[PDB]
Amino acid sequence: TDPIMEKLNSSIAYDQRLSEVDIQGSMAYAKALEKAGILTKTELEKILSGLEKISEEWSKGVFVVKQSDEDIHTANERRLKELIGDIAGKLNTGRSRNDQVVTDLKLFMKNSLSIISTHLLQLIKTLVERAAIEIDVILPGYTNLQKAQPIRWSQFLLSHAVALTRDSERLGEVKKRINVLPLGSGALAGNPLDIDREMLRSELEFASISLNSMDAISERDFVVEFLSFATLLMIHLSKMAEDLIIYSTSEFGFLTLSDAPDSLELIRSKSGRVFGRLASILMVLKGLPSTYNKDLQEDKEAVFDVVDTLTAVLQVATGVISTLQISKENMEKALTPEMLATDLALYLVRKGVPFRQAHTASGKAVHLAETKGITINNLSLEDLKSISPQFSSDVSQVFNFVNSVEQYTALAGTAKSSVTTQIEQLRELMKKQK
Amino acid sequence: DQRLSEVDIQGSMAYAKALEKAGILTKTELEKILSGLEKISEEWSKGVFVVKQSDEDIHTANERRLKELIGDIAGKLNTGRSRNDQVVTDLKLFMKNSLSIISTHLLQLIKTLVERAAIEIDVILPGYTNLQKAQPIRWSQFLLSHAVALTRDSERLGEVKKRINVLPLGSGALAGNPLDIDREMLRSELEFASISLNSMDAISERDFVVEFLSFATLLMIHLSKMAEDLIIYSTSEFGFLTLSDAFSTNPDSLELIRSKSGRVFGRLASILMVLKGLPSTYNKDLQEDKEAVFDVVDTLTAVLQVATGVISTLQISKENMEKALTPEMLATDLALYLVRKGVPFRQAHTASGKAVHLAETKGITINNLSLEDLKSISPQFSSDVSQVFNFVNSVEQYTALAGTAKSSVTTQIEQLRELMKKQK
Amino acid sequence: DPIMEKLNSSIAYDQRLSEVDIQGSMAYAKALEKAGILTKTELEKILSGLEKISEEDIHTANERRLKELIGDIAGKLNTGRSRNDQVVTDLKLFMKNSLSIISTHLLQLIKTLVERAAIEIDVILPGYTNLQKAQPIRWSQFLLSHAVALTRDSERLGEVKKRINVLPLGSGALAGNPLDIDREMLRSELEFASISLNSMDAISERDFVVEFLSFATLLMIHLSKMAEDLIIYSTSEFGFLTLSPDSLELIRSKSGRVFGRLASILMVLKGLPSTYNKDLQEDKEAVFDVVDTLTAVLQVATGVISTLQISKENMEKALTPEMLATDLALYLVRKGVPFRQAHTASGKAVHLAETKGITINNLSLEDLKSISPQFSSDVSQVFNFVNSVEQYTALAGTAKSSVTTQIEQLRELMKKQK
Amino acid sequence: PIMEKLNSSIAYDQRLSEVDIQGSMAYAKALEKAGILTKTELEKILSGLEKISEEWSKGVFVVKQSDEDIHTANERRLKELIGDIAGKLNTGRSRNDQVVTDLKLFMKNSLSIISTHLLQLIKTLVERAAIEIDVILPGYTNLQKAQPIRWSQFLLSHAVALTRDSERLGEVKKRINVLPLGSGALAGNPLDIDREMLRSELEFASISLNSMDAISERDFVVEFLSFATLLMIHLSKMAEDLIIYSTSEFGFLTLSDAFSTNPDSLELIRSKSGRVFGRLASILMVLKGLPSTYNKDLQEDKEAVFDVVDTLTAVLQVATGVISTLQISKENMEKALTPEMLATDLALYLVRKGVPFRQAHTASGKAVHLAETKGITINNLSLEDLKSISPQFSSDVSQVFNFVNSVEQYTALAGTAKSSVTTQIEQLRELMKKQK
Ligand SMILES: N/C(=N\CCCC(N)C(=O)O)N[C@@H](CC(=O)O)C(=O)O
């Protein structure tokens, strides 16, 4: 009576990409039905063959949807009907859309997450592979967007690599809980025909099966975990984009991007988009009583969008990180003797000069250059040697940026030895994540 | 003025022994510090301290304290160290301990549900779909569905504690530690599993905070769902069960649990926005992490225990649960009856539909229909069809894994017990 | 490569901005003529072409079918006009139109609730607190409570519509229109109420989008609550009413969908520097989805309210004597007994009752006086649900006089908000 | 014990002590008029309430572990000051219509304080825009120098966004200024209490239209949060602009030692956007799904509001100071201005000569290409170098390479031209005042 409601439950529009997983679900169920005694070796063949046909149709868009197809489910159950005959009805025996729609989603997500996984590690591998050939480049490090202290351009690219490797790790943990068979849970209390679930697992290639039908029917944990996985990933990409946006300014002049688009902006904007899907599903799920509820239908559109977003955005990021051109001279140009004010105290420290008792001489020399109109390195022992009995003719080495970075040899530091170690550590993480 | 203190002291003791191995300190100094710090941990576990107001972060409350206990020697304690890698070290140690507290309570809740399902394994009540009676299920199938979702929260918690259990200390301000400090020693002292791979990341990253909140948010969703169910079942209308009174006030205990969901979610949304737009490396913004962490930790700890209490002390009304079962609900089982006799899917329900009508037409339920009546709808109906109109039998059709048959339930209980054991 | 360009392909979902786009162009064209950048003839040219387009990204689409229709003359149309102020003019014009539609749907829902409250004013059922029977209330009081909340959404709707009804066209890329274009003429042509104050603000702000979404989410909150109530009252256990599917679940599920949009835009905006940034392109999809969601949901809600069937029988059956315990206490309060003395006197009547295994309305006058000699024989007027509800005459209460008065304050509000 | 600790609210709802007392005084008065209280009783209760009012003011009031919430604490207090008589105060009242009456009184007052601070910030922006009206700096798009603009056109774009926030604040305050008291538990007040009298005493504009709604809704809380969040988006954006601008790289400005503790103050402001957004999200999820009427879930409103009220109140004053005491560098903002940025103005030059928009830029770009292959800038090309591309190029073309003239092209309302900037200041000046 209400053309509004009908359209509201109309999903065939965006849901069709599940055509394949919906088909492989029926084939699997059919086979189990024959063993369950509901289907004969003969009927099964007729059914599989019909399902194989419709399958090959989509692979060529040849398929044709009618104006009566509510969703991908019926669209096939229909074509299958008008193909092998009324013997098409035996296939839906004992099954429900409740465990059929969740089977479809995890299969789809398990497939999609493999795609994403590939692109993600490719990105990490680009950052890492770039941090290896530009390991000598040095530029400013920031704290509240203010030149802090000297660091290697490579320590920068790897910091994003490390954050991203953790996303790959979370992805894997999410993929494992998704790789569990929900089919066979029926509409609520389970499958009433003593169907062979282990067989379904095998055919559908899941790693294991759902423990409780009610939970397997109502939980969307796998959707939320995924969205939260995707969201944290986006936070990382927007952080990277933010720095690249800043460095690519005229004012910074640190680097330039390829192309002939505004790609970095896109990457940053998608974090909100993705975040919106997380918030959406969490509120849809909050307050719902057991077991199955119409509300759970909002999961699809969210999964689809984030799936395509991460896929397009990851590849774009790889491109950027592989074609952007840095300016070693401008990154060096940015370095200043002021930044060496930190190491300055460190000189006294090794000489035995205690903490604060060493950081005092640091500021003194500064306000003094702010007095003699020079940079802390232009001074001399005909002075500094006064600010502290500790300034042999070797303190001169302190005013060298390469030596500055080389101080951080400890694990995780910016020294070339610490970086190289990181890169080897990252090749290990990847060689394992696979 | 409380929590981050004890881990802070431990953070200094470890960096001290390590500062001593770097040459910055001597056995004398090390002893006078590692004895004064221990002297401070000694006070808090009593109730002495709290002073002035120039001391911003608890760090200074402690740092500026040393000058008293010993003197200007304490200054060296921060040699090479930064407040940036020092604050994250405090947080991870805090969360590591908290996660342990929480895990204990979580597993207790799960066991409370598992243990209760085993004892009431015979009780039967209606299962719901869009809140309408759909079909008979065992009360234990209900309890176990929650317990299952909760074991996944435990798995997530474990995955989160793992990445939190990594030493960030030694990263300094952003480029690393300048004195070639021995981070391996720090790890051993503080007892982390491994050490951070990159200084800049370890300083700025707040992945560990997001994950924890994301873990806490899904746990609360699960908790708000159980609460919703019990609130509904505890209404007069349903009359399925009542709360012990200690958790009542009006099942306040349930409303509380459910309301905490948004509270916790707000924190997740909060930290995600603080991080969203931010260039590397450290930024003052990251300070908003602590209050968010502290709040979710106390909420989870309290909420989990209230939940355990409710589940173990609520009284079910087996009577009303069984009086809720109607013949109406066995219409599908009737169609299933024929299906096991070769009757096709469509015709099966078709026939069953007539049944409901033949009785819908008269003044009796489908279980009062005689063999004569059913036969006028399908010669496949035998006198044994009467075994359909038995709720015990209804539930016993689901023998396939995950189903509500008695055997499947006992299988689940055994699997969950393994799961809990695994959770250690 | 189609992996990055694909993302900027804002054409498959915003073709609905075709009409509003052409109007901005017609209007800008006229202004561009008075500015002298276009000859009187060059005007009829770059306008008769737009004439056909409407008769049949979206910008390029029209900015393409235009040149290939009137020749190269159409090129002078972009003179002094940036996409930044053109895209913002499109959304604002589009949202205004969508808000009038939405307002009409919202008004219909409110009117169906009020109208239903008028006719079913004699129905009484349990009022809940923590989903536990609290005090007897009129079914109409329940309906007017949702209607009242919805009237606040309509009020919020107008407040947002006002700030949206401001002309953004003419702000240029960011510093403004360089050709001293007559914005008053642009305003009148396009029908805005006034024009933007600062060009930078007009190019980069998306307040109007955040405001719309905040209005939409709160509105969805109100709708998900009404639905939740109707989901519970329609359960077999409650049996208060039946709907003439899963419409209720459908309405409730849309709250999160809309909340998601609010959350995403807020996150997209946070931390962006001035002035314009590509990121802002995410506003469209979110606005389109929420406009369709509200348009459909509101109408589905209206249907539900007018066609659901209540059960006067079950609703009254649900009224138990225990719900009148407070009324019992209030019986003494009106006699003169202090607050505490009465409520405890009522507490012992409920005790003395459960003891004997009866309901409080069955206690004999004798048994009551052993609890308080203040219980005259008139105490029987208390165990009456119409009398219970009729105690609440004070404005806003559930007494019949208050309900009728509410229906009138609302009847005037609907009139106001329109 | 855990349950009791988690169910308790006394610990934080203490701030409502005064508004709670004020609420009771009003009710007490209407309760006396209703006949539930005698003239003497009223005076005793009133005097008692006044005494309790001071105990909190002087910070004397003592809390008992038995105090479950601020409402109970005060009730107990009157009891020990006037005895049994104090118990008759709650007659016909509920913690349901009482708690919301309290929250609304608190928010009306807190909103007045926020309004003051918001307007002062806007005033600070406008006053500075008037004075530094000649300063010119680059305008940005995707953080790439686009076209020149006046520093004031920049300051005002922020002032304008903030005026809309002040407008939204006024709208929220209106719906909050409604009396919820007398709604009871959910069915209304049974004693026929005079609510009109209540509105008058507590100074509300109007009264609750429906009992059930008045006790279950938190619109007023969500609106305030939506108001707060959008306001923080504006402050986070300005903070982000000032952060970039204060970098050594840009060097357009620097903060005074007072705030820039590293522009710390700016980062402190930006961070709060998420903190305020979080509260918005929580309450929205807390209400979603909640059935009619009152539910314990609604208790989460208070801590959310307190956090956002104290946050905005601190952040608004920090922002005002930052804008007031910051030091710009006219020299740098001026150097940032480059000839390349005028390439477009050069294109419009021809446009103002009957030259088609098409051949206009096609002729403009070539001017950038010509000087592109000479290692100079467009302002250095010879008059002959120009006429070559388009004889339309007169001798006055020179003037185009002047930044002041660049900004003065935008005379149309809203632009960055000076006449436009002064008009804006007058409009915003008027917007405020009409505002209040
Ligand atoms: N009084 C009451 N609860 C109130 C709470 C105030 C509070 N601590 C808050 O923050 O909301 N509800 C009654 C309603 C009735 O009897 O109708 C009940 O317990 O059932």
Q: Which residues line ligand 1 (CB under 6 A)?
A: B 250; C 129, 134-135; D 9, 69, 94-96, 99, 185-186, 294, 298-299
Q: How far apart are CA C412 and CA C399, in angstroms?
A: 20
In A320-337, which positions are buried (b, 16+ CB within 10 angstroms) versus exposed (e)? Answer: bbeebebbeeebeebbeb
Q: How far apart are CA A341 and CA A335, in angstroms?
A: 12
Distance B246 CA to ligand 1 centre (A): 17
Q: How far apart are CA A86 and CA A66, in angstroms?
A: 19
User: For residue D153, what are the CA distances in angstroms to C176, D272, D326, D410, D423?
Assistant: 10, 26, 17, 11, 11
Do residue B272 and residue C267 have CB atoms under 8 angstroms apart? Answer: yes
Distance B259 CA to ligand 1 centre (A): 15
Q: How far apart are CA C47 and CA A115, in angstroms?
A: 49
Shortest CB distance from D241 goes to which of C128, C176, C273? Answer: C273
SS (H, E, C) chain C: CCCCCHHHCCCCCCHHHHHHHHHHHHHHHHHHHHCCCCCHHHHHHHHHHHHHHHHCCHHHHHHHHCHHHHCHHHHHHHCCCCHHHHHHHHHHHHHHHHHHHHHHHHHHHHHHHHHHHHHCCCCEEEEEECCEEEEEEEHHHHHHHHHHHHHHHHHHHHHHHHHHCEECCCCCCCCCCCCCCCHHHHHHHHCCCEECCCHHHHHHCCHHHHHHHHHHHHHHHHHHHHHHHHHHHCCCCCCCEECCCCHHHHHHHHHHHHHHHHHHHHHHHCCCCCCECHHHHHHHHHHHHHHHHHHHHHHHHHHHHHHCEECHHHHHHCCCHHHHHHHHHHHHHHHCCCHHHHHHHHHHHHHHHHHHCCCHHHCCHHHHHCCCCCCCHHHHHCCCHHHHHCCCCCCCCCCHHHHHHHHHHHHHHHHHCC
Domain identity same for A183 and A35: yes
List residues of B whose CB lies inside 8 A of any C CB: 130-133, 231-232, 235-238, 250-252, 255, 269, 272-273, 276-278, 324
In D362-401, which positions are buried (b, 16+ CB within 10 angstroms) versus exposed (e)? Answer: ebbeebbebbeeeeeebbebeeebbeebbebbeeebeebb
Shortest CB distance from D267 goes to which of B256, B285, B309? Answer: B285
Q: How far apart are CA B10 and CA B346, in angstroms?
A: 71
State the Cα torsion B90-B92-B98-B100 to the nearest 10°. Answer: -130
Q: How far apart are CA B364 and CA B379, in angstroms?
A: 21
CATH value at residue A28: 1.10.275.10
Distance C254 CA to ligand 1 centre (A): 29
User: For residue D211, what are the CA distances in angstroms to C155, C182, D185, D207?
Assistant: 20, 53, 8, 10
- For residue B65, give how far its alpha carbon lies from the nearest alpha carbon of chain D (Å): 24
Burial class of C244 by CB neighbour count within 10 A (0 to 12, 13 to 18, 19+): exposed
Contact list, D244 vs chain A (CB under 8 Å):
145, 246
* A313 part of a folded domain: yes
The residues, any chain, with a CB within 8 Å of residue B283's CB and separated by 6 or more, are A143, A144, B204, D267
Most ligand 1 atoms within 8 A of CB, residue of B250, B252, B253, B256 to mutate: B250
SS (H, E, C) D304-327: HHHHHHHHHHHHHHHHHHHHHHCE
Q: How far apart are CA B401 and CA A197, in angstroms?
A: 7
Contact D130, D418 (CB under 8 A): no
Ligand 1: residue whose CA is nearest its atom 9: D299
Burial class of A89 by CB neighbour count within 10 A (0 to 12, 13 to 18, 19+): middle
Ligand 1: residue whose CA is nearest its atom 10: D299
Q: How far apart are CA C323 and CA C334, in angstroms?
A: 19
| CA angle (A329 as vertex; A326, A332 as ends), nearest 5 | 100
Residue corresponding to tokens 């005793």: D44
State the Cα torsion B282-B284-B290-B296 to the nearest 10°. Answer: -90
Most distant pair of Cα atoms in chain C: their distance: 102
* A2 part of a folded domain: no
* C2 part of a folded domain: no
For helices D17-33 and D195-202, the axis angle rounded to 10 degrees is 140
Contact list, D209 vs chain C (CB under 8 Å):
148, 396, 406, 409-410
Q: What is the resolution of this structure in A?
A: 2.3
Q: CB-side exposure of D142: number of CA atoms within 13 Å?
A: 17
Domain identity same for A232 and A314: yes
Q: Which one of B204, B222, B256 terminates a domain?
A: B204
Domain identity same for B278 and B142: yes
First to last CA, chain A: 54
Please report which residue ranges of B71-134 form alpha helices under DSSP H.
Answer: 83-119
Domain identity same for B298 and B386: no
Domain identity same for B407 and B282: yes
| Residue A145 C-alpha from the chain's centroid | 26
If DSSP codes are grouped into helix, strand and coil, which group holds residue A140?
strand
Tell me which amino acid residue C250 is. L
Domain identity same for C135 and C216: yes
Domain identity same for C281 and C380: no
Strand-strand pairing, C124-129 and A255-256? unpaired
Shortest CB distance from C271 goes to which of B132, B272, B276? Answer: B276
Please report which residue ranges of B165-278 form alpha helices under DSSP H.
Answer: 183-190, 199-204, 207-233, 252-276
Contact D151, D333 (CB under 8 A): yes
If DSSP codes are grouped into helix, strand and coil, which group holds residue D36?
coil
Gap positions in chain C, given as the residue before each gap (C–N > 2.5 A)?
Answer: 56, 244
Contact list, D5 vs chain B (CB under 8 Å):
302
CATH value at residue C398: 1.20.200.10
Ordered DSSP codes for A50-77: HHHHHHHHHTTT-----TT--SHHHHHH
The residues, any chain, with a CB within 8 Å of residue B47's CB and separated by 6 or more, are none
Distance C133 CA to ligand 1 centre (A): 13
In C137-164, which positions are buried (b, 16+ CB within 10 angstroms) versus exposed (e)? Answer: bbbbbbbbbbbbbbbbbbbbbebbbebb
Domain identity same for D401 and D417: no
- For residue B137, give how far its alpha carbon lies from the nearest alpha carbon of chain C (Å): 17
User: For residue C65, what are the CA distances in angstroms to C51, C82, D164?
Assistant: 12, 19, 39
Contact list, B269 vs chain A (CB under 8 Å):
279
Provide the 10 A C-beta neighbour count for residue C366: 8
Domain identity same for B299 and B415: yes
* C5 part of a folded domain: no
Do residue C250 and residue A293 have CB atoms under 8 angstroms apart? Answer: no
Q: How far apart are CA C407 and CA C148, in angstroms?
A: 10
For helices C207-233 and D219-245, the axis angle rounded to 10 degrees is 150
Strand partners, A256: A325
Q: How far apart are CA A69 and CA B307, in angstroms?
A: 45
Contact list, C131 vs chain B (CB under 8 Å):
231-232, 235
If DSSP codes are grouped into helix, strand and coil, which group holds residue D12?
coil
Ligand 1: residue whose CA is nearest its atom 6: D95
Ligand 1 atom nearest to CA at C135 = 17
Q: Which residue of A has its CA nearest to B333?
A: A192
* A370 part of a folded domain: yes
Domain identity same for B292 and B193: no
Experimental method: X-ray
For helices C207-233 and C247-269, the axis angle rounded to 10 degrees is 160
Residue corresponding to tokens 């030091």: D327
Q: Which residue of D has its CA nearest to C125?
A: D187
Residue corresponding to tokens 């955005």: A313
Q: How far apart are CA B248 and CA C116, in angstroms?
A: 37
| Residue D178 C-alpha from the chain's centroid | 22
- For residue D213, give how far its alpha carbon lies from the nearest alpha carbon of chain A (Å): 21
* D428 part of a folded domain: yes
The residues, any chain, with a CB within 8 Å of residue B139's CB and separated by 6 or more, are B117, B120, B123, B124, B125, B316, B321
* C4 part of a folded domain: no
CATH value at residue B350: 1.10.40.30
Domain identity same for A371 and A299: no
Structure tokens, B129? 């779909």
Most ligand 1 atoms within 8 A of CB, residue of C129, C133, C141, C350 to mutate: C129
Phi, psi of D139 (to 5 degrees): -100, 150
Contact C170, C176 (CB under 8 A): yes
Going by C-alpha positions, the residue among A5, B332, A70 that lies closest to residue C244 is A5
Shortest CB distance from B250 goes to which of C132, C235, C318? Answer: C132
Distance A122 CA to ligand 1 centre (A): 57
Distance D284 CA to ligand 1 centre (A): 21
List residues of C whose CB lies inside 8 A of any A CB: 3-8, 228, 245-247, 249-250, 252-253, 255-257, 259-261, 263-270, 277-282, 286, 296, 299-300, 303
Shortest CB distance from C267 goes to which of B231, B236, B273? Answer: B273
Which domain does A349 fall in, by range? Answer: 336-407
Count contacts between A and D (CB, < 8 Å): 45
Shortest CB distance from D274 goes to which of B255, B288, B305? Answer: B288
Count contacts between B and D (CB, < 8 Å): 101
* A25 part of a folded domain: yes
Cis status, amide bond into A336, omega within 30 of 0: no
- For residue C334, give how far its alpha carbon lies from the nearest alpha carbon of chain A (Å): 42
| Structural domain total, chain D | 3
User: For residue D226, what are the CA distances in angstroms to B265, B318, D230, D279?
Assistant: 17, 47, 6, 10
Q: Which residue of C has its CA nearest to D361?
A: C79
Q: Which one of D187, D216, D245 terminates a domain?
A: D216
Going by C-alpha positions, the residue among B198, B303, B213, B214 that lies closest to residue B253 is B303
Domain identity same for A155 and A271: yes
Most ligand 1 atoms within 8 A of CB, residue of D93, D294, D306 to mutate: D294
Q: How far apart are CA D401 and CA D406, in angstroms?
A: 8
